[PDB]
Nucleic acid binder design. Structure first.
Length: 187
DNA sequence: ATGACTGGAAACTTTTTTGTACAACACTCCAATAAACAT
């Protein structure tokens, strides 16, 4: 609905603490490349960033694929949000990960990435892959206070025996010739 | 009788443990910075 209806907003995915859902989002991203051709998706891997800063310039080198530039020192919050508001460019999709680890003493770095798809020219979809540690209490104080932002929340319940036993039937019976254990040990 | 006994006798000292209140503290970060290692 966002790529066809020309819409853009935020989407906070609060996954279960440690369940291995990183491969679920990778399946959807690769299916959109073979369906539609014209858009570009920039990845994010802030595992080597021990500080709260040096995050925006790390993804500033990907402007429009073939058109790149170079940093000049102290130039954020000016050129990154300028190219996003351009209606002549394609719909850029930004992926977010471990957003809880990017906090600060006043989480000021998280006040600019959640207000871009809500001001003029909303052409950015927010996708945050992170487990459940804390909801909207101190990270995003705009909720339960401001009536401008309307985020969406989706949770994932823990898989009981209805899914763990099911995920093993299509795992061993499709690649092995004969099972090595009985059905009583699976339960 | 009032003036003499035992008989009971109300405020009232003590503590006090309760919350708060404000003391540090290791503090992550920073902000050049400065020399060094390229030029």
């Amino acid at each position: 609905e966002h790529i066809c209806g020309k819409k853009a907003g935020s989407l906070y995915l609060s996954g279960a603490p440690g369940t291995g859902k990183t491969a679920c989002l990778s399946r959807i991203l690769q299916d959109l490349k073979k369906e539609l051709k014209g858009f570009k998706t920039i990845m994010l891997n802030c595992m080597s960033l021990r500080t709260a800063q040096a995050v925006f310039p790390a993804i500033a080198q990907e402007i429009c694929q073939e058109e790149v530039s170079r940093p000049a020192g102290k130039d954020m919050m000016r050129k990154l949000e300028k190219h996003m508001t351009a209606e002549k460019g394609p719909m850029i999709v930004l992926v977010l990960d471990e957003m809880d680890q990017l906090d600060s003493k006043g989480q000021d770095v998280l006040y600019t990435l959640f207000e871009w798809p809500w001001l003029s020219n909303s052409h950015l979809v927010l996708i945050g892959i992170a487990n459940t540690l804390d909801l909207t209490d101190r990270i995003l104080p705009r909720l339960q206070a401001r009536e401008k932002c309307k985020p969406q929340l989706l949770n994932f319940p823990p898989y009981t025996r209805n899914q763990i036993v099911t995920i093993l039937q299509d795992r061993l019976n499709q690649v092995s010739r004969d099972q090595v254990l009985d059905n009583a040990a699976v339960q």
